[PDB]
Design an enzyme around this catalytic site. Sequence first.
Site, PDB file in Angstrom:
ATOM      1  N   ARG A  15       0.849  -1.228   0.000  1.00 11.43           N
ATOM      2  CA  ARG A  15       0.000   0.000   0.000  1.00 11.43           C
ATOM      3  C   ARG A  15       0.873   1.264   0.000  1.00 11.43           C
ATOM      4  NH1 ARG A  15      -1.571   2.934  -1.922  1.00 11.43           N
ATOM      5  NH2 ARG A  15      -3.166   1.391  -2.394  1.00 11.43           N
ATOM      6  N   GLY A  37       2.124   4.886   0.262  1.00 11.67           N
ATOM      7  CA  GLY A  37       1.585   5.911   1.205  1.00 11.67           C
ATOM      8  C   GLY A  37       2.053   5.524   2.603  1.00 11.67           C
ATOM      9  N   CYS A  38       2.098   4.233   2.830  1.00 11.19           N
ATOM     10  CA  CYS A  38       2.561   3.737   4.157  1.00 11.19           C
ATOM     11  C   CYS A  38       4.048   3.351   4.034  1.00 11.19           C
ATOM     12  CB  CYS A  38       1.738   2.502   4.537  1.00 11.19           C
ATOM     13  SG  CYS A  38      -0.059   2.704   4.651  1.00 11.19           S
ATOM     14  N   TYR A  42       5.625   1.005   4.808  1.00 14.97           N
ATOM     15  CA  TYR A  42       5.616  -0.448   5.134  1.00 14.97           C
ATOM     16  C   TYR A  42       6.293  -1.193   3.988  1.00 14.97           C
ATOM     17  CZ  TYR A  42       3.747  -3.428   8.763  1.00 14.97           C
ATOM     18  OH  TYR A  42       3.622  -4.204   9.893  1.00 14.97           O
ATOM     19  N   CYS A  43       5.673  -1.124   2.837  1.00 15.81           N
ATOM     20  CA  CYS A  43       6.222  -1.813   1.628  1.00 15.81           C
ATOM     21  C   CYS A  43       7.656  -1.350   1.404  1.00 15.81           C
ATOM     22  CB  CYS A  43       5.375  -1.431   0.417  1.00 15.81           C
ATOM     23  SG  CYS A  43       3.620  -1.142   0.725  1.00 15.81           S
ATOM     24  N   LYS A  56      10.423  -3.408  -0.585  1.00 17.48           N
ATOM     25  CA  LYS A  56      10.999  -2.852  -1.846  1.00 17.48           C
ATOM     26  C   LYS A  56      12.493  -2.640  -1.653  1.00 17.48           C
ATOM     27  CE  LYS A  56      12.258   0.868  -3.120  1.00 17.48           C
ATOM     28  NZ  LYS A  56      13.432   0.392  -3.912  1.00 17.48           N
ATOM     29  N   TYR A  93       6.448  -8.473   5.174  1.00 18.10           N
ATOM     30  CA  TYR A  93       7.896  -8.098   5.224  1.00 18.10           C
ATOM     31  C   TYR A  93       8.687  -9.037   6.152  1.00 18.10           C
ATOM     32  CZ  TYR A  93      12.288  -5.814   5.559  1.00 18.10           C
ATOM     33  OH  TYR A  93      13.639  -5.536   5.515  1.00 18.10           O
TER      34      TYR A  93
END
Length: 85
Positions: free
Chosen positions: A8, A10-11, A13-14, A18, A72
Site C-alpha cells: 500500500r 503511502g505507508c 511499510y512496503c 521494496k 515483510y
Amino acid sequence: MQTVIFGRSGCPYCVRAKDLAEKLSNERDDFQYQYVDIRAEGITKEDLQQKAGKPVETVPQIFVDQQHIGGYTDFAAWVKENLDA
C-alpha cells in the site's frame, strides 16, 4: 528471480520489502524486483487473496515468482535463509 511487492503506497511499510528486494536486486546480479500497488494500479483483494493463500485482511504482501511468502517479516526471514550466498 522475480520478487514482487504488493503493498500500500503511502505507508512506510512496503518500503522495507521494496528496499530489501531492490538491494538484493543489486547485491545479486540474478535478482530483479517489482513494486505493484493494489489501488494505484487496480488490483482486487479477492484476486490477491486467491493468489496469496487467503491472507484474510493482512498487508503488505510479498511474492517470489510463483510462491507467496507473506509479509515483510516472512520476506526478510525468507531472504536470510535463502540468499545467504
